[model samples]
Structure formats: C-alpha cells, structure tokens
Target: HPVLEKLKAAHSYNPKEFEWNLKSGRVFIIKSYSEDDIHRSIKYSIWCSTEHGNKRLDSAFRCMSSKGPVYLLFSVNGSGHFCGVAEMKSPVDYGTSDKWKGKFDVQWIFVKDVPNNQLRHIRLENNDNKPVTNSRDTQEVPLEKAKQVLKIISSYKHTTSIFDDFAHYEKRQAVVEVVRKERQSRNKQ
Candidate 1:
C-alpha cells in the first residue's frame, strides 16, 4: 500500500510546486490573480470563478491542444485552505464539480476539511494500515500521497474521468441529465 503509506505522512500537500509540473500541452499553471490581474487577464486568457476567486488555475492553455488535457488543478476555499483537486480535460471545459460518487469511475476526493459531510474524503492509513475516515479528524495532510494521485490521474487506467469521442464527456453528462429530468416530467404527466 505505497499510496496508503504515502498518505499517512505529515505533509498534506504542496500545491505551488506541482501546479505547473505540466505545460506545452493541455496543462499549465495560472498563478493567483489579484483583482487587478483578473481585471486585466480576464480580457485576454480565460477563467473567472467565485469559488476560488482571484485564485490560481492549473491546466492546459485555452487555444486547444493536440496532446489534449494533461492533468491536475487546485482550488482554495473561503477558509483559505485547499478545497481539492479538479481533473481538467481542458482549462475552459465547463462542469467542474467535485463530488465523490460510489461508482467511483470519475475521480473526486475532498482534500479540504469541508464542513458538510463530503464523500470520498481521502483517509490516511492508521498504524494498523487501514483507511481511516477523516474530515477534521486528522491532523496532517499527505503531500506524497497528493503527489502520487497524479500518477492515477495521468495513467489513463479505469478512470471514469476520460472524455468520450464527443467534445467532452462531462458535457455529454449534462445533456443526459436534461433528458433524465424531462423523462420524469413526462411520466408525471
């Protein structure tokens, strides 16, 4: 359980360093944009978010990539702590929600101590080598484990995060939701 052992260590995460580990592809780092920077950059680059307001962005550049999306993104919370990692197929792709579904195909892990009962809050192994459920219960966040997570993200394994032949799979999911909602309304009629 190298991944588990790595997660147990004291280092929680090192965002500043790894954020730009990938570039020249659908991956790059946009550092913390002050309102002044945002006021200027928004007219040029692409991105504006209230959730991680005036914050940094990590992923590919907007123009489009032959290599496609590389990997990795970090966003901060209102409390000034890291909320979690968001896997991006492209920096501009819509539908970037982070939630853990049991199906666990698409990746969602809450790295922050969210007040709500967030799902898939990654737990570190105890002395007994078992995954411990954690939110604020744990004291340390594992930087190495956080580092190792990128291995999974980029490996193209059984990940649910892969985009389909369509423009973007997450975008496709949005279309499906509308259909599902409309079908239920038709049934009620």
Candidate 2:
C-alpha cells in the first residue's frame, strides 16, 4: 500500500514518468506510454503466464528490496522504446545459487540498456533456454494498471523466512566468484 501511495504521488507529478522509493528502501519507476505504442507493442512485449505472473511480480518486488537499484526494462514490438524502472537496495551480493533451482532472484531481472532495433519481438527466455510460453488471454495493461495489480497482489501476507541457509550462503559465494571471474574476463577484453 505504501509503495502504491508513493507511486501515485510520483504519477501525479510526472504522469508520463514517475519513480517510487518504497519505505523498505526499494525504488520503483513507472513510465507511461501512448495508447498507440501499447497496441503496436503488446503482441511482442514480455509477459508472464497467469499462473506465474503474480509470483514474478512479487519476486521482483522482493528482489528490489534486496538489491539496490533493480531495473525493470520494458520494450514493445522490438521497435518500441525501452524504459527502465530502478529499485534501490543494499550493496550485498545476493547472487543466485543452483540450490534455489532458479526460483527467482533480484539478479535475474537486472539487465543492460536495450539497444534500438532490438525490440522487434517479445520473447521470454529463462536462465535456462526453456521456451516458457504465457497464457494467450494475457492482456497488455497500462503501467498504472500493472501497478494497481501489483498493489492488489501485495495485499496478501505471506510467511517470511531468512535467506541465510547454509547451502544458499555457499551458493551465494560461488556466484560472487563466478561474477568476479566474468568481470575480470570482460576487463581483459
């Protein structure tokens, strides 16, 4: 509810582009688009299946809380503009582990800025190359509507558990090592 309130306030000031920083210290930026763009891009836009969409949204929020400046990049029809929503968090490396079995994490959503001309189609590819298809009835809702849905979804309370399991911690360390190696390789390039 507080996140929604902050988002609404941001929307009031800049309806086209607004950012909300949650009390939990996560930032959410929502950018509005013209109706024409929505129609043209919805077909090729990224969407979640009904069964997983809610969970995806919820995990994304949690990731935002855990990771600093989480980015939600939205592009439509492979030709539409790519907008970013940044949610801030701490500096800890909450990397992924094989143990989690790809349930969901903040790192899964972080992405580089999308380039122009690369927005031709909306494809949903998991960390694995599985071709997970969404429901056909999934509608392309406006950013505001999406936020409302997220708000509604957040209303439900769930039990929380510490993410500090031994296996999880080990996996986290492994992820950090992998990232370090990757960064080093990139720097060498």
Candidate 3:
C-alpha cells in the first residue's frame, strides 16, 4: 500500500517540485555515466523514503539478477541508439521503520563495451541466443531530440517535467511488476 500511496502522491504533486527531485537524481545518473563513456552505461545508487519504492526495486533486481546482467536500451524513435548493462550490488537497508520497512538502498553499476552493431537494438539473449521476453528495450536519443519528442507527445503542456516523471515511473513500475508476479508465483509453491 505504501508504494501505491507514493504513486498517488506523485500523481497529485506539483510537477515543478517533481522536476527538482528528478534533477537531484540526475546527479547520480551523471556519476553513473562518468564510470563509462563510449557505451552510455552508468552506475547509480538510489535511496527512497517509501516502502513501495524499496519493494518495487527489490522485486526487479531479484528477477534481473537471476537472468544475468540487465542491460538498458536507449533509442530515439528515428535517430540514435545505445545500450548498457547494469549489475546490482548487495541491497542495503535504510530509512524510517514504518514508512521504510521495505526501504533499502541499491547500487547499480552499468557498463557497455559491446561493439556498436551488437549493442544497437539489443535483445536479451541467453547463452543459446534465445530472446528473453521479460526484458525491456528503451530508446535513448540526444537530449535535444528527446525534448522535441516530448513537446510533440505532451501537446498542450510543457513536456520537460512530464517526460522526466514518465521515465521514472515507467522504469520503476516495469521492474516492480515483473518482480511482484515472479515472487508471488514462487511463494505459491
């Protein structure tokens, strides 16, 4: 419920403040990129105050970790393409008790050294070259291009804030839902 509550709060929250929070997270993203250059992979350590955030990521890591290293795909609808792999370190417990019982800190180091051809339009493949359906593919374009796309996507409203929030929520949700269902099935047995 805490995770759901946080999502609700995010929905009602002023986008201006949300943009600021995203900027703060941006520092971590920058650091992640500093660790690697040519490939666009980055490392990030994130902390959340709510149980929902913690639980959500925990589920994602559990699944991704089991499948092997998880890679992030970046693309522009019609332009650039890039991908990076993320490896999770141990999860650290942190934050207040009631609100943060599920709260934990995670460290992810992303690296991409694959040759360009292989890295582009990456599909999650196992040792046998079979595609992994649970995996996600993302397109990353230049900031300018992304901004333009945002403007088109958002239509009436300014899209910078909306783009930021959409990316954050979508990424988190995708990972969490995968983990949640995976865990539930395992627990059933």
Candidate 4:
C-alpha cells in the first residue's frame, strides 16, 4: 500500500507527477453527490457506476489502453466543486449491485478540495454538446484545460477538511460491505 500511502500524503498537485501521467493518458471529470461518497471512491480506489451505467467508464477504459493513462477529476454533485484528482489504475471490475455493476481502481494525485468558483473563471473546452463545466456524464477535459485547472489548484492552499484520510481509516474492501449492508437494511424495511 505504499502507492496508497504516497497518495494519502499528497496535499497539493505534484507538477512532475501530473506531467508524467499526462504524457501517456487523458483527463476526465467524474461526479459524486455526497462528501463521504467521493471519499469512499478515493479510499477504495474504485469508482462505482454512473447514472448511465458503464457507458462512460467503458469508453474511458478503451482510451486508457490505447492512448495511455486516464486521470479523473472528481466533481461533487450540484455545487460542481472539484474534490480531488486521481489516475485510473485498473479497468472496470464487473461485480456490484444491479445498479452499480462495475468499479475501477484509481491512484489519487491531489487530495485537496477546490471550489468551482476558483476554476470556473477558466473557460475549458466543451464536451457532451455543452460546456464541460455543466456536463453530468463523465466528461473528458482536454490536456490544456486540465493543466490550467492544475495550475489554479497549485496556487491555492490545500483544503484538508474535505480531503482528509477519514475514508482510509475505515476498513479495507469497504465498498462491497457498504453496498451489502445498504441492501440488507433496505430488505429489513
């Protein structure tokens, strides 16, 4: 778990790491609704299903294999704030609930929580027939725009309150357990 440890120690974006990872990959924007949900994804190194199932993740895998690495820009739902940044490490693992049937591994790069207002000023390239800032799906952010976002992220002091190691303090393999308990709780009702 040294790699995981390295990720946890990260408070700011490492320019060399970002530049190196970008050399062999593309950048994407992923979303979650709750603070815990996003932290869970980072802690477990897995991103569960999207609203549209695996369509977006499937496409991400293809590019990762062919082009290079795939960096994920995690944006929380509603407020559009960017929570953290990570690089995809593995493809979709085909096991989860009916709704969330797959998950992927990721190596977190930046664990700081950045507000959208700090970045919205930079006009990113549009994706999904609209501006990427507004897209709901897992949208890809171009290299140039991604760099701009990272630059802004580097300038701002890291916000530890939202990106702490709270998620990792939980048990390992918590994804399945959490889902199982949720299902059980629902069944009990």
- Model 3: residues >4 Å from true position, as ranges? 1-44, 47-56, 60-79, 92-117, 120-189
Which 10 consecutive positions of candidate 4 have the poorest summed lDDT?
A: 12-21
Task: Give the per-residue lDDT digits (tens) of candidate 3, residues 1-189.
Answer: 344345434433222221211111101111112212211112123333234434444555555554433222222122222222222343535544511243333332221222223322333233133222122222122333223322222232322222233345556657967999899999999
Question: Which segments of model 4 are wrong by more than 4 Å?
Answer: 1-17, 51-53, 96-99, 128-132, 164-189
In candidate 1, residue 32 scores what lDDT?
27
Candidates in order: C-alpha RMSD to true structure: 16.4, 18.3, 15.4, 5.1
Q: After superposition, how far is residue 2 of candidate 1 from its true place, in Å?
A: 41
The residue pairs that clash in candidate 2, if any, are 27-88, 68-89, 69-87, 69-88, 78-119, 78-120, 79-119
lDDT for model 2: 0.32
- Give the clashing pairs for model 4: 24-68, 24-69, 25-69
Cα displacement (angstroms), candidate 2, residue 89, comes to: 11
Per-residue accuracy of model 4 over 71-168 as CA lDDT, tens digit each:
77777778556777777877777754333457777776766777777776666547534445565647667777777776766555755645355646
Residue range 95-136, candidate 1, lDDT tens digits: 443221111011222233222122223444432332212322
Worst 10 residues of 3 by lDDT: 21-30
Which sections of candidate 1 miss by over 4 Å? Answer: 1-46, 56-71, 74-142, 159-162, 165-189
- Model 3 — TM-score against the truth? 0.24
